[PDB]
């Protein structure tokens, strides 16, 4: 849309793959603070915040924790302790016209700096003296929304970079988004270490004869020995017996 009143989405209740994020081909710059990319690919959270917008290439250096500039001081400001990562693509083809893909007008006049993630979309007249240009002209007629004038002759510093920022919130987290796969094929009739959806143990697995009710997932005999388990993939019931041991 614009850096003026950026666009947002609150991701929740899914399995965050990431297989494409920062691994798809046309990504230009991606870097996160506080979290490593692979751990990220295995981390899981309560919610996600995506914030896309378009800025001029020469201003990408201002999207950083507490970084200072124009776009990051009066337009859109990310916190100082911001955990999460930003990504920027040189959209030197996707959003540009020789006539000027300047439909969006960024903010160049603000009364006071932004609090982190404060949508500050407004249509006002920055001024110096008493009146705005509705009754005055020349002096004190300033308008914060300036066009971009994106056209292809423009150099890199003025080529529209599309940027998307991800923010992971972690307070009181009955986390609804965790998507790491990691499911290996099952082996039967051999002493094997098994990990069924959190149940960890060791033993030999054998075809079952027990009628599990559809809402049950585990089976236990007397004295809490977990005796059987249903597979989370094929729903087949399996019996567990510890492989042979004894004195010599």
């Amino acid at each position, epitope marked *: 849309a614009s850096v003026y009143a950026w666009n947002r989405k609150r991701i929740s209740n899914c399995v965050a793959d990431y297989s494409v994020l920062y691994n798809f081909a046309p990504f230009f710059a991606f870097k996160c603070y506080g979290v490593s990319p692979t751990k990220l690919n295995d981390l899981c959270f309560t919610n996600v915040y995506a914030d896309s917008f378009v800025i001029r290439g020469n201003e990408v250096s201002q999207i950083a924790p507490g970084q200072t500039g124009n776009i990051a*001081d009066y337009n859109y400001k990310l916190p100082d302790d911001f955990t999460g990562c930003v990504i920027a693509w040189n959209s030197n083809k996707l959003d540009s016209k020789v006539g000027g893909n300047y439909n969006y007008r960024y903010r160049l006049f603000r*009364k006071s700096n932004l609090k982190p993630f404060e949508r500050d979309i407004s249509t006002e007249i*920055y001024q110096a003296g008493n009146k705005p240009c509705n009754g005055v002209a020349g*002096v004190n007629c300033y308008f914060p929304l*300036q066009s971009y004038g994106f056209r292809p*002759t423009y*150099g890199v*510093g*003025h080529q529209p970079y599309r940027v998307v920022v991800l923010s992971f919130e972690l307070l009181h987290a009955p986390a609804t988004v965790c998507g790491p796969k990691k499911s290996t094929n099952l082996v039967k009739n051999k002493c094997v270490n098994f990990n069924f959806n959190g149940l960890t143990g060791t033993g030999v697995l054998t075809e079952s004869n027990k009628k599990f009710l559809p809402f049950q997932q585990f089976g236990r005999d007397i004295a809490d020995t977990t005796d059987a388990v249903r597979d989370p993939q094929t729903l087949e019931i399996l019996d567990i017996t510890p492989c042979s041991f004894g004195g010599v």
Partner: antibody
Amino acid sequence: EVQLVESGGGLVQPGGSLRLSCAASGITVSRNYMSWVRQAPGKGLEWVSVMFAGGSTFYADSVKGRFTISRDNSKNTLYLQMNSLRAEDTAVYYCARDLGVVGATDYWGQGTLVTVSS
Amino acid sequence: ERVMTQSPATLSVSPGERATLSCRASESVSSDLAWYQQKPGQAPRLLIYGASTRATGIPARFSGSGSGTEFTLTISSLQSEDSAVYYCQQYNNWPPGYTFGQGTKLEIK
């Protein structure tokens, strides 16, 4: 009338400090992008510093770390503290109010000479 | 940091005619500009900013043109008081930035 009057120009021994002041009129400073520029005798001009409306200031590279811009909002004025004045900094310094893409610098300051003992 | 180069260095033209000054950039400057007339003895005065927009008051006798990396200023009919130095200032990096020219000395006869 709308104007910018300057003060602090003078002479100081090398390595010394000084403080330049800039007063405005018929126009506010708190809400105006302020910018101090300087000119060596006989040469062109060079952007020295700027202070924004949020406090984030900036300086040229030649003077980074030594000069500091600040502004007395109560009486609509700007200030620039300088220190460790060396042989180069002998120049006339101008105060300006810059709008940018919507009108380039127009309103300028009377200037202030800054020379050294030798 | 685009370095601007003015041309020619000096110019002496008979009264009543036109005058043409070129200012050349090294990167793109297409509409980031201004032209200042510093009459000898005081601070400069803005005449034409951006590409060719005439600053308020500034006599129509001035005309700016050019785009990209090259621009030119032209004066219709020089009067005796037009003698001053002129500079083309770019601001392609606005927060915080400017880059001045070498200036031009204009006289009469």
